Write a protein that binds this ligand. Structure first.
Ligand SMILES: Nc1ncnc2c1ncn2[C@@H]1O[C@H](CO)[C@@H](O)[C@H]1O
Ligand SMILES: [Cl-]
Length: 301
């Protein structure tokens, strides 16, 4: 992973946009892929920590352009873009800053009921529109076929762990994957554009009006199961929990809530495997070793 000096950030931007005066530059936050810099309190510029992150940033730029002006909450607008090199598909990008603070579960549960309900309705409406966007222009690098993802994961896990697990432990890994694969419910969805990291840290809130004022972080958006964007809201402490999320599902007119729950339960168990792979694909040994220990020692449905 690479980090950046403030000077490097300013030089990179100067190279392609020499007429843009930078007065203020501060780190705004940081995810798996990118470090974010707030520039002139007007813009957020993302700089990739690594190649994989850069490809995600390239995709985020492409998606945000394709959906500009289509959705009923504000989303970042692409204003500046960097260049490809032998290392990065895109060396940086600058988006409009969306104002607001994350709608944390704490903040949400302290709102008056009327604003909680309005927030659930505004989310459903946003997701209905997002999930309705015409996907036919989106190439295969943006398509995340869940069955292919599960089979490809099964193969990455075997390749990574065949020297790390004993016989019965790998047996339990095969039983687990066989069980998921034989359940049709995970695989029969109508593919749609999904945010795919749809959680409270990415939902921005205006406390003067008590209304959601933006959705951010599209670097994982992909063509996939629309249910992914309800399950990412559901974790009982970390996120909103079921009472709130069923108001979103009801506003969205979801026809099959129990399927949403079943997907959520499966994704809870699936986390150990995600941790191994993420471990290696994003260079986080801590996750790797945590996921390995869980496969080694603990029951998995
Ligand atoms: N366009 C934006 N407007 C407001 N905050 C942003 C924006 N983009 C990124 N951020 C912040 O920097 C982090 C990493 O992208 C985000 O989760 C958020 O904290
Ligand atoms: Cl469209």
């Amino acid at each position: 992973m690479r980090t950046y000096t403030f000077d490097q950030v300013e030089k990179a931007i100067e190279q392609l946009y020499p007429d843009f005066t930078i007065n203020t530059i501060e780190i705004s936050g940081e995810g798996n892929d990118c470090i974010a810099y707030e520039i002139n309190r007007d813009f957020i510029f993302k700089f990739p920590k690594h190649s994989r992150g850069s490809t995600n940033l390239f995709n985020e730029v492409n998606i945000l352009k394709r959906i500009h002006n289509k959705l009923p909450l504000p989303i970042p607008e692409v204003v500046f873009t960097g260049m490809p090199s032998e290392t990065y598909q895109m060396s940086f990008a600058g988006f409009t800053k969306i104002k607001g603070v994350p709608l944390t579960p704490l903040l949400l549960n302290n709102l008056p009921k009327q604003s909680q309900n309005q927030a659930a309705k505004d989310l459903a409406r946003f997701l209905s529109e997002l999930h309705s966007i015409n996907i036919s222009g989106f190439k295969s690098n943006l398509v995340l076929d869940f069955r292919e993802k599960i089979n490809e994961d099964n193969k990455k896990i075997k390749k990574l762990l065949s020297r790390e697990l004993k016989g019965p432990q790998m047996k339990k890994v095969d039983d687990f994957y066989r069980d998921i694969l034989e359940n049709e419910i995970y695989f029969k969805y109508y593919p749609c554009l999904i945010h795919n990291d749809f959680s409270s840290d990415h939902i921005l809130f205006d406390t003067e009006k008590n209304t959601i004022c933006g959705i951010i972080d599209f670097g994982d958006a992909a063509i996939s199961d629309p249910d992914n964007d309800f399950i990412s809201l559901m974790e009982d402490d970390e996120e909103y929990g079921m009472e709130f999320v069923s108001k979103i599902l009801n506003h969205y007119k979801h026809k099959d809530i129990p399927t949403v729950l079943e997907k959520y339960r499966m994704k809870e168990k699936y986390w150990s495997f995600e941790k191994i792979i993420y471990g290696k694909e994003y260079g986080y040994m801590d996750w790797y070793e945590e996921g390995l220990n869980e496969i080694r020692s603990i029951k998995i449905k």
